[PDB]
Design a protein around this ligand. Structure first.
Ligand SMILES: CCCCCCCCCCCCCCCC(=O)OC[C@H](COP(=O)([O-])OCC[N+](C)(C)C)OC(=O)CCCCCCCCCCCCCCC
Ligand SMILES: CCCCCCCCCCCCCCCC(=O)OC[C@H](COP(=O)([O-])OCC[N+](C)(C)C)OC(=O)CCCCCCCCCCCCCCC
Ligand SMILES: CCCCCCCCCCCCCCCC(=O)OC[C@H](COP(=O)([O-])OCC[N+](C)(C)C)OC(=O)CCCCCCCCCCCCCCC
Ligand SMILES: CCCCCCCCCCCCCCCC(=O)OC[C@H](COP(=O)([O-])OCC[N+](C)(C)C)OC(=O)CCCCCCCCCCCCCCC
Ligand SMILES: CCCCCCCCCCCCCCCC(=O)OC[C@H](COP(=O)([O-])OCC[N+](C)(C)C)OC(=O)CCCCCCCCCCCCCCC
Ligand SMILES: CCCCCCCCCCCCCCCC(=O)OC[C@H](COP(=O)([O-])OCC[N+](C)(C)C)OC(=O)CCCCCCCCCCCCCCC
Ligand SMILES: CCCCCCCCCCCCCCCC(=O)OC[C@H](COP(=O)([O-])OCC[N+](C)(C)C)OC(=O)CCCCCCCCCCCCCCC
Ligand SMILES: CCCCCCCCCCCCCCCC(=O)OC[C@H](COP(=O)([O-])OCC[N+](C)(C)C)OC(=O)CCCCCCCCCCCCCCC
Ligand SMILES: [K+]
Ligand SMILES: [K+]
Ligand SMILES: [K+]
Ligand SMILES: [K+]
Ligand SMILES: [Zn+2]
Ligand SMILES: [Zn+2]
Ligand SMILES: [Zn+2]
Ligand SMILES: [Zn+2]
Lengths: 391, 391, 391, 391
């Protein structure tokens, strides 16, 4: 009596009917019942119920029945144990906190990492490797984005902005830059019109941040025809809009893998970012106050102002110094010049190293896990599902 | 004879009675005795004693009986093995040092991470999410703490401290800052009085560092009425007391999780902090002496003073340079200017990188373990104890 | 019926013939067939097939048959499991992505880490420890390479380049340096001729980068006889060729182990290098643009130029500052001087720390694995293959 | 025939006599022989040999017999497997390189971490906690070492070295410093004489570096009586000897644990230190040459000297800049000022980060392992060897 033998994959597990009967509703509980013989695969010759499952983990499942705490066996992958306890009826949200982080790891990484001529029209936006025209158009858009960025960076230069003797006198940009900008705008407008030709699910097309960036970047040049008092303000904000013209590089870099992994890492490590920002804000505030007060101890009594010989004339300046010093950057534009100031400075450097090295390793481990998983899923050749499951 | 078969969870373990008899007082030892049959669950049909326990770890327990050294099986969580050996009677302080740190890990992290209208009065200090009035009062205290801190930081500024032509002539602060400070003091005194209304266990309320900070921060303004020769000294120390007014931000940030984890990490990594401070002190002293002597080799014989062309006129200046250089901060206010000085400087930079990267990774690993455990225990939904233990 | 017992190394595994029959072509599939008895080692007494293999992993192989997903048992080394599944017929490219990176790890590291007087002639290029003459010649070439490098570094100095009153007036190098260079060239030409005497597989000898470096380094001196208008250009490029004379140190350092491990790490971490370069390029571009525009907000309206008080007169200067600031180098030649500029600067420092600490740990882990494996394979004494395999 | 059943700890392992017979000389080989029955514990009832050992690892030992490669089971501590294979007769130097580093880890860390009134005389040098007089004398020597160090550091100061109007005119040190030095010398000489009173194994006492440092530090003061032409040279070298007076702090810090762990780490990581020094030397040389040549591209043709506007007037200056820049120190005393120089500078910063982060993590992991093991062995309470081994 009350002696039941479970045969799992050829390994006989023995236990009392009470231990099975503890956790109700689960399959083993139904086993403990008196009418189990009829319902299950039970042979009267050996008085053992036979289950065709991995025995090495059924040990741990039955252990959950015995003691009362479910743990993850550290010798099997999380998904294997997940599938086994799913079969046995155990809820996965019961595992002890000692095992939860190792267990729910692959599934977290996986979850985070996850009209006739219209195909030919849309073939200019598909992946470059998906065709030959696609790769050609991709190379061309790469060339033109790079040309736009170089024109921008050279337009801000002095050599290309001489000031003419024209009378108000201001520097003017060379015509060649404006011509190259016009060419790039013509090409980008052609691409944008071709991509507007076919726009399925136009709501998501407008919600697509890349097309938003494209349109905002192409707005300032096109506004040359549209553009006197309001015109000055709109030109002033048009410079700020043009400022985004460097953001067209994400159009090219979106097809990279490391960047998608970085996006997933950022989106999945919000808590650690908030933690880092809070740590830095507290450190900056405290050390700015401390250095501002330390540097006033040695202030000369002659000068009317409280601080004349110190860079730390107030606390916000302390904020700047504290950031530069905690990140071990150390420009040297402002540094302590009093023994008290030097003590506070040494404390700031050490505390900065520590409170920067606290959450950054968490973020780095997240990126490492996501990058390894993405590189694996990329490397692994497409499978043909060799295992034909039985009916 | 001397052949005993232990049946643990359906797996038959065989061993000699002598091996069991080695370690006395334990349950298996009692098994080895001649009257075990009567006391234990022994069936004469198979001459095997039956224990309803995990067999995969009973292997390792019996191994401790056999060889004489207790180890932790690396395929089970520390708590699972802890509970198993606790059942078998093995003392947990016997495990070999090769296994102690992996074993006693979760339990270390866990240990470190651990009248009618009076409920409505006290509801202003409970958690914000615990009510609606609570969250409102929390937002209001947040606004007022931030306003106090901004008033402080702007009060130390020059733009808000013009010097009037009043005759002694000193800069005076604008009235608007004093008015905002008065408002914030009124609000904080109202909060403090409401929280004094109900003060259970007043000894711990006074021992509560947060209320201490609150009272010390509210003392200087209230002392305006209380406050001639002693008055100058008390004002001088009152500025230093006001210096703490930035510490009211911990009142808000105490409810954050990362900060509690950081507090536990600090309190649990005292040894590594002392190690870091000793390493830095030795490095600073040695390299200050070395650079001070190196920079004198090339001293010009003309100048009467020993050092005129070097920033390293003495050793304490060496302390400052050595800290700035070992933390890879490198302000550039003082740097070596002699080939010997440059050799010593390169040695200082490398030795600083090394003796800073020695203990900091230990501290970082501590924080990582505590943060993962705290985030797990926060994420895991409240359990309902599905396992109804048998009587 | 449909009940088959597999005996693997004395452990009886039981399963249905259907589960074996799922995955076809594999050995167990052939077992499931009706004529298995004749073909395999089957004894009718126990109706069990006997396989002389590790049972602890046959559990996981049969689990692949049962569920349909192949995993790596985390309690056995990758090569052990590799050999077991190779025996059983399972393809190794079926393991789940959760296990692929741990599994295919040692094999990745291993793959990356992998006429009578002519022996006496060639003995001057073999390993130094391979003979006594070899070690002597190696020491001599070490001395002469070091002498060449020191002559170069002193030749570029001022103390050794006085300007004589000879009439055009230019500084000339001392004769002693030219004599030492001549001596070193004589020795290197003797070595190179002796090594040309015996040159098996001359195609790979010319493809050998070390000999290429040797010949390019020995070309400029020998060109003294060969060398008026073209002569000036060839001397100008000859200085640039001489620039390589420091590269002869790799001839000596090639026999070091850490350097070969570093070469293998570099060649095996191309993807992470491209990732680091893309991250740095995006960060540099974005932050250069941001700081250039931030620093113009506070520009004084008096000056005709857009920026007079800021170091950030254009964007490329921003590139330089952004690199120096993201690597936490912080020279201090250029730094923000406007509250907006300081905000952008703090963002640059933090983003640089983060996007530098993203891929560098991946690269560091690669080097650590390769270095541990190389040091192991070096330390382990040469084996004598104690296991005489059975026929 | 050729079917042998090994019973290890109640688990029946089955294999062919040939597989056992492969590896000769080992215990299992002797089992395979025809006269094994008489020699071993064999019962004819079940035709199984019984061994009272852990079965979970005998699986892997028999696997070595089967396949031919010995691996470490990743689910047992290295010492447990070591003892098991030691019992079975397997040589420990056979494990595959995939397992060698995990296996030989604890044993590496452990190996690296390892007349009547004469007891009362020597009690002044024993551990402080070993008595009360011992702790008192230790505190007193601490006070006096600290006083000596402070006297030294203040003696090098300007405030304590005024120059008197005595006629040659040089600064002289105050008498109070000389008096304090005399007091400290009296105390140290008393300690040294008391410790010379009892000097067992005087060869090792003289080889003891601490006593060497003590005697060298006490020599200069005592030489006041001993000390005209040679006297100036001996005073000049006496200043350099006094330079060691800061080394008396190791006398106190030797009893610390972290410092002994650091000493063991250094002594056990010589290879990685040599690797770091070689990496830094190659980087410094290459980047010094590169920056010196890059900065000359933009040299103005007017100046007679090759370089007038650049800090990089020669290559050794390049060595200094390259160290300061690769360690991300960045003083700012010298920095590139040409677009080519800036390119080379960015390369130097990145290459420095990389080739510094290559071996330093290896060294850091060594220190972490040694520190964890030492802290464990310190924490663990003294055992009483509960396991009374059987005869
Ligand atoms: C100001 C500079 C800050 C950057 C602004 C935001 C950059 C950005 O949004 O880039 C996103 C692309 C990914 O683009 P995607 O999401 O994979 O493809 C389009 C599909 N939609 C968007 C319609 C769902 O690329 C990325 O994921 C990069 C993420 C972070 C880059 C820094
Ligand atoms: C901790 C919380 C951080 C919050 C900091 C937010 C500050 C936002 C500023 C609001 C606008 C201020 C303003 O309008 O002007 C006030 C003055 C301007 O003064 P300025 O003349 O432009 O400053 C030049 C500094 N020199 C070089 C002359 C010494 O301002 C100044 O005098 C200098 C302002 C200093 C601000 C430096 C911010 C540094 C970043 C801190 C961020 C850390 C968070 C992580
Ligand atoms: C001068 C600046 C240095 C900081 C002074 C100390 C700051 C501090 O004490 O903050 C503590 C709070 C935690 O507050 P708590 O302990 O969780 O809540 C109150 C319960 N008592 C205190 C009664 C047991 O918050 C923290 O735990 C922060 C710990 C470290 C913050 C830096
Ligand atoms: C190793 C052990 C570290 C212990 C160091 C404790 C020092 C405590 C100081 C005690 C009080 C000293 C005093 O009263 O005045 C003495 C002088 C003051 O001289 P000062 O005029 O104020 O210094 C200005 C420096 N200029 C810029 C001119 C070059 O002082 C000076 O000349 C400069 C003092 C330099 C102190 C810098 C301390 C740097 C932090 C070291 C901490 C490392 C620990 C980790
Ligand atoms: C300009 C400076 C950049 C360095 C230029 C390239 C340096 C180099 O090529 O060194 C290679 C040697 C290894 O030499 P090796 O490959 O082992 O031996 C000769 C066999 N061959 C080449 C014929 C196949 O040494 C190395 O592997 C060092 C690799 C990286 C060193 C930095
Ligand atoms: C992001 C993508 C990075 C690509 C950057 C490539 C730049 C290649 C330069 C092409 C040739 C430029 C040229 O011929 O001359 C144009 C001017 C020269 O001006 P200069 O007088 O020689 O600069 C001196 C700077 N002072 C000190 C006066 C302020 O040039 C200048 O005004 C200064 C040029 C600044 C270049 C600094 C490069 C910093 C490295 C960035 C690399 C990061 C990649 C990781
Ligand atoms: C010039 C500064 C460089 C330091 C010079 C060497 C310092 C030193 O030797 O300190 C050693 C002590 C350990 O002293 P100990 O070895 O444990 O005790 C005496 C037993 N003997 C030595 C007789 C075997 O303390 C240490 O182990 C510290 C090791 C490294 C400290 C830096
Ligand atoms: C790579 C291999 C590294 C080996 C380097 C060993 C150098 C040893 C020096 C030998 C003695 C040199 C000598 O006697 O004098 C020659 C000159 C002295 O010139 P100085 O006037 O004293 O230098 C002052 C520099 N100012 C500030 C003026 C620009 O010397 C000079 O002009 C400046 C010498 C620059 C030496 C700086 C060494 C930086 C450390 C490199 C170590 C890296 C290894 C890791
Ligand atoms: K740094
Ligand atoms: K720095
Ligand atoms: K600097
Ligand atoms: K710096
Ligand atoms: Zn898996
Ligand atoms: Zn657990
Ligand atoms: Zn292995
Ligand atoms: Zn162990």
């Amino acid at each position: 009596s009350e002696r039941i033998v479970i045969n799992v994959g050829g390994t006989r597990h023995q236990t009392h009917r009470s231990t099975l009967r503890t956790l109700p509703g689960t399959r083993l509980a139904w086993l403990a019942e008196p009418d189990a013989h009829s319902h299950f695969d039970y042979d009267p010759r050996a008085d053992e119920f036979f289950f065709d499952r991995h025995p090495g983990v059924f040990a741990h499942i039955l252990n959950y029945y015995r003691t009362g705490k479910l743990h993850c066996p550290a010798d099997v992958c999380g998904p294997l144990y997940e599938e086994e306890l799913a079969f046995w009826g155990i809820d996965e949200t019961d595992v002890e906190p000692c095992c939860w982080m190792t267990y729910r790891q692959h599934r977290d990484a996986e979850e985070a990492l996850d009209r006739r001529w219209q195909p030919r029209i849309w073939a200019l936006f598909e992946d470059p490797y998906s065709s030959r025209y696609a790769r050609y158009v991709a190379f061309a858009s790469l060339f033109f984005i790079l040309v736009s960025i170089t024109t921008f960076c050279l337009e801000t230069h002095e050599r290309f902005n001489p000031i003419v003797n024209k009378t108000y006198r201001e520097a003017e940009t060379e015509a060649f830059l404006t011509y190259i900008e016009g060419v790039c705008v013509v090409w980008f407008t052609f691409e944008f019109l071709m991509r507007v030709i076919f726009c399925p699910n136009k709501v998501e097309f407008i919600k697509n941040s890349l097309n938003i960036i494209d349109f905002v970047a192409i707005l300032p040049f096109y506004l040359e025809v549209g553009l006197s008092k309001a015109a000055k303000d709109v030109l002033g904000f048009l410079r700020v809009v043009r400022f985004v013209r460097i953001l067209r590089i994400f159009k090219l870099t979106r097809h990279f893998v490391g960047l998608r992994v970085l996006g997933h890492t950022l989106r999945a490590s919000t808590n650690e970012f908030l933690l880092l920002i809070i740590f830095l804000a507290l450190g900056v505030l405290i050390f700015a106050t401390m250095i501002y007060y330390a540097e006033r101890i040695g202030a000369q009594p002659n000068d009317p102002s409280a601080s004349e010989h110190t860079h730390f004339k107030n606390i916000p300046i302390g904020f700047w110094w504290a950031v530069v010093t905690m990140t071990t950057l150390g420009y040297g534009d402002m540094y302590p010049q009093t023994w008290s100031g030097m003590l506070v400075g040494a404390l700031c450097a050490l505390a900065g190293v520590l409170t920067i090295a606290m959450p950054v390793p968490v973020i780095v481990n997240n990126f490492g896990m996501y990058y390894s998983l993405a590189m694996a899923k990329q490397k692994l050749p497409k499978k043909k599902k060799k295992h034909i499951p039985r009916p």
